[PDB]
Design an enzyme around this catalytic site. Structure first.
Site, PDB file in Angstrom:
ATOM      1  N   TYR A   1      -4.191 102.168  34.571  1.00 57.88           N
ATOM      2  CA  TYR A   1      -2.924 102.556  35.155  1.00 57.88           C
ATOM      3  C   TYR A   1      -1.854 101.692  34.558  1.00 57.88           C
ATOM      4  CZ  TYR A   1      -3.974  98.456  37.935  1.00 57.88           C
ATOM      5  OH  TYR A   1      -4.243  97.184  38.356  1.00 57.88           O
ATOM      6  N   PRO A   2      -0.646 102.212  34.381  1.00 52.57           N
ATOM      7  CA  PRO A   2       0.422 101.416  33.822  1.00 52.57           C
ATOM      8  C   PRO A   2       1.069 100.871  35.067  1.00 52.57           C
ATOM      9  CG  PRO A   2       1.158 103.567  34.220  1.00 52.57           C
ATOM     10  CD  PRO A   2      -0.322 103.606  34.526  1.00 52.57           C
TER      11      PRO A   2
ATOM     12  N   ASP B   1       4.474  98.344  36.685  1.00 51.92           N
ATOM     13  CA  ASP B   1       5.666  97.543  36.562  1.00 51.92           C
ATOM     14  C   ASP B   1       5.693  96.489  37.652  1.00 51.92           C
ATOM     15  OD1 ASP B   1       6.520  98.642  34.303  1.00 51.92           O
ATOM     16  OD2 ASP B   1       7.936 100.065  35.194  1.00 51.92           O
ATOM     17  N   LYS B   2       6.563  95.521  37.436  1.00 52.70           N
ATOM     18  CA  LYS B   2       7.001  94.681  38.507  1.00 52.70           C
ATOM     19  C   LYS B   2       8.346  95.236  38.962  1.00 52.70           C
ATOM     20  CE  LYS B   2       3.912  91.461  38.730  1.00 52.70           C
ATOM     21  NZ  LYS B   2       2.984  91.719  37.584  1.00 52.70           N
TER      22      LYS B   2
ATOM     23  N   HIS C   1      -2.942  86.543  42.614  1.00 53.01           N
ATOM     24  CA  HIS C   1      -3.377  87.708  41.865  1.00 53.01           C
ATOM     25  C   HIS C   1      -4.542  87.332  40.951  1.00 53.01           C
ATOM     26  CE1 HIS C   1      -2.404  91.834  40.516  1.00 53.01           C
ATOM     27  NE2 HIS C   1      -2.837  91.426  39.313  1.00 53.01           N
TER      28      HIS C   1
ATOM     29  N   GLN D   1     -10.991  93.361  32.902  1.00 58.20           N
ATOM     30  CA  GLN D   1      -9.609  93.780  33.002  1.00 58.20           C
ATOM     31  C   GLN D   1      -8.979  93.490  31.655  1.00 58.20           C
ATOM     32  OE1 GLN D   1      -6.333  91.940  35.980  1.00 58.20           O
ATOM     33  NE2 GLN D   1      -8.448  92.209  36.667  1.00 58.20           N
TER      34      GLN D   1
ATOM     35  N   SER E   1       1.271  92.323  44.411  1.00 61.60           N
ATOM     36  CA  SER E   1       1.133  93.775  44.323  1.00 61.60           C
ATOM     37  C   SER E   1       1.933  94.417  45.436  1.00 61.60           C
ATOM     38  CB  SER E   1      -0.291  94.228  44.357  1.00 61.60           C
ATOM     39  OG  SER E   1      -1.063  93.492  43.399  1.00 61.60           O
TER      40      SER E   1
END
Lengths: 235, 235, 235, 235, 235
Positions: free
Chosen positions: A131-132, A134-135, A158, A171, A209
């Site tokens: 999945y792409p 963003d922050k 995280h 990952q 997140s």
């Protein structure tokens, strides 16, 4: 921001299969097209063997895409070359564009742990999830508007959630700021697809997140061995 | 977050029917394609009988989709296999992709109440309604940013609204964090489709829905018995 | 929330016309397709005469859609039956899907008032306007987060604006919570299309619309009498 | 809200040209299709001459659209008639739908300055720019939630910015509340396309635009004289 | 707002290649189509030589687009002429529309440094990256709602980040307020594509980007020399 180290460019090329058309294509023609595409991947395999890049092919469950080629190549021009060679195969006539994502494996370059992470031979795990992300830069929750240290602290928990699901999910984060539409592409590889649900959900309960994550579409799929490719296109 | 128990993977595969093309397809050919697809579902039916999975086929009202196959299979690879076998049927040439959703029946595994809920034989109710949903992570109303207890309390009233519409609407919630674009897929099954409007509207007046609910598209449809499939494709 | 009374299910099926294809279709064939579709509506007309449902056909201005069938039927299964019979007409080969909306006429049932509102014979007005709408659940302006009384007060002024434009615009509100993507479908019928602009704009200056209104696409169109259908498809 | 005066309905019909198909169409056939469409506009020209409506054709730069027909007709039924006559021309087989916008020239009717503004003969300027716009109804910046006077004051500076660019850019605002997806359609006409950038940018530094402007897509294009139409479709 | 100086109009025309169709086109025909398109660019090259405009062709990595033509011409009518000549080439039958962006090189006109920046001969760098951007007009972070000086100060640090990546990345900003959907089009040109990631990411940690940046899609690609064009379309 200048602290990130840069490895391979990464293209996730998701395609959909036009099964209806593919069926109409005569058997011997379809066979050749598989052969042709297999010989292409055979090229990619040679590249991977020379440690000069990496790929993964996964069939994606659901209708978002049917198949994903994930290619990691040293240069972006190499990426383009691959996409374009793919597109000019017979098989690709039936592999309609679905979604694509360009990004660069991001984290001294010489250090082996860096080297492995920067130039990653993609894991041949049963499943993959992409999945792409963003922050968020939205109002109060603007990651970019944050302190370097606050960011660091955010990323600390995280790291902890990630680390729990290490030895289950690999990952691969690729940064795609100014390479594509989001800021990171997250690819996970696990032998158990549930571990993806487990990792990404547990991650959402991290402030990082929870507060800052804006994510794109999730794609999950199953590794398509190349011995399984003829089978998969059998009609 | 680690407390959720995991049952079957669930694919909701919504397709649209290309009626125009389907009509052009000769009668005997169309007949065979129905037969072929029926024999496929007959496979699925065998799986359901062995308690090794479940499906439901519903025709969806409206233009979002024409038909939904909902398949629950133990492994995601099984899901993929089904999608791909579907796609490689004649009929599927006319069942264009509309929307799809992958997710996992989520709620110790040995306990019957859990077992039933985790490995649910989907109810053969007149109607079904599906919508994917998220919990909002937006500013003040950030579910993920909430206390475990606050969340629990939020979900307490949601349980109460659900429970009112039990014995009317069966609810299958599937978690899809890191399996698809939203966090949950909610499938309801009722013999009365209005009970869906009743349940989902009453739910919206719960703080949890009111504040935190971000929902996707709603699909509702009517059960397509397989005895009704030949009829439905009659042109 | 449980106080709403439920009448007919309502499908707004908006289609676009593939004029180019339609022109290619021979004259006698096109003629038959019109005849076929006319005989279909003739069925619908019989249903309307028996007070067992209602429809309206309007041609929609603009490119969002070309024609709208609005069908109100007692059961959702009836709706589906109609959509599917439409789709399996020749004409429908040229009526591409554009947008659709399912919903239920919502407002004891025995009273002749309320009976009319729940089971409404749709007005044969020159023009129609449709838009789906939500109540905002966004931050401070969260309708669902509101007091029952505050809601009541909000809706009080909305009733007043509506009432000003009664005897000009007939308003059919259909609730679509858990039937489609928005919460209400608003259909207006007026002999003057400007009265739509007048009503919906004046409404926006009501706190309820101003603050809570999230609206979808607006479609407006002109009544297509069935005597006008042959003409309209003349090429 | 009741103070706005209403002139012509306005359709902006943006189409894209299917050049590839158009090329395949034989020369003499293409010639006839141009002739046919020219004779259609010749009808429109007659309408404009009788002051019974107005049109403009512009070719739109970029890929959003290739050509815009902007038609202003007294009734919405007239608009529909035009769209439908357009669509049933040969040429329109190659003018694919791109975007459309319905709206009504809005600003007692007898007064000439009103008359001109309400029933505007569209200016035959070298360039046109169209964008639909809303006033934000979002949180704190909710135009609708504003005082009548505050609104008036907001619009006062907007009038001033407009007025600076008068004698350069003609502005036709059409209200489309309950006629289409946004609230206003703004069409500008200038002999210099830069004046559009100048006007719309300067406007954004007005509180009204800055705070309340939610805009749609911008389309700009160049006037397609009808003497230039044969040329433009020459392949 | 009136302080910005205006150079060339700029069209970024991104297309996708229909490889499947292109392959079907006979060899000699494909050869001619390349020749035809090459002769077109040869026209553009002549324009560039006369300093009467500029172009760049880049092949874009990923599925967003396959190729970008970036044309800078003095007038918008020239831009349109080019787009339309492109579209009416054989090759363009296979270059499907992907995305387009119109904008004007923006920064007294007589001064050479201005002249160069306003009428820029686009750099023949290995790679290009394009993204359209807005300044946020959202709540608290409303750029337009800002003080002229605050804006100036915001842009001061942005100038500094840009300046760090000067001599690596050339930046062509084109303003597109009232010319297209966003406010600026940012085109970067570097011999290293990573420098794009570096520049745009570092920029995001500037208050201006962090707070006010709303960006569109990012496209990156590799320069397609015209001697490389025959090769690239070889099937």
């Amino acid at each position: 921001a200048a602290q990130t180290l840069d490895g391979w460019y990464c293209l996730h090329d998701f395609r959909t299969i036009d099964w209806s058309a593919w069926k109409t294509l005569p058997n011997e023609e379809r066979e050749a097209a598989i052969s042709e595409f297999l010989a292409l991947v055979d090229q990619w395999e040679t590249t991977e063997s020379e440690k000069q890049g990496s790929h993964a092919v996964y069939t994606i469950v659901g209708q978002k895409a049917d198949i994903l080629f994930m290619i990691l190549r040293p240069t972006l021009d190499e990426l383009h070359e691959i996409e374009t060679a793919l597109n000019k195969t017979k098989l690709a006539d039936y592999l309609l564009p679905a979604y694509s994502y360009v990004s660069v494996v991001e984290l001294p370059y010489q250090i082996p742990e860096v080297r492995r992470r920067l130039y990653p031979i993609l894991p041949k795990t049963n499943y993959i999830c992409f999945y792409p992300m963003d922050k968020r830069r939205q109002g109060n929750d603007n990651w970019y508007m944050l302190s370097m240290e606050q960011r660091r602290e955010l990323m600390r928990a995280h790291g902890m959630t990630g680390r729990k699901y290490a030895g289950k999910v690999t990952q691969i984060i690729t940064g795609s700021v100014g390479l594509d539409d989001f800021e990171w592409g997250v690819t996970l590889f696990s032998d158990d697809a549930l571990q993806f649900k487990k990792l990404v959900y547990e991650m959402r309960f991290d402030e990082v997140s929870a507060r800052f994550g804006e994510f794109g579409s999730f794609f999950v799929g199953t590794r398509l061995p190349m011995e399984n490719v003829s089978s998969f296109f059998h009609v």
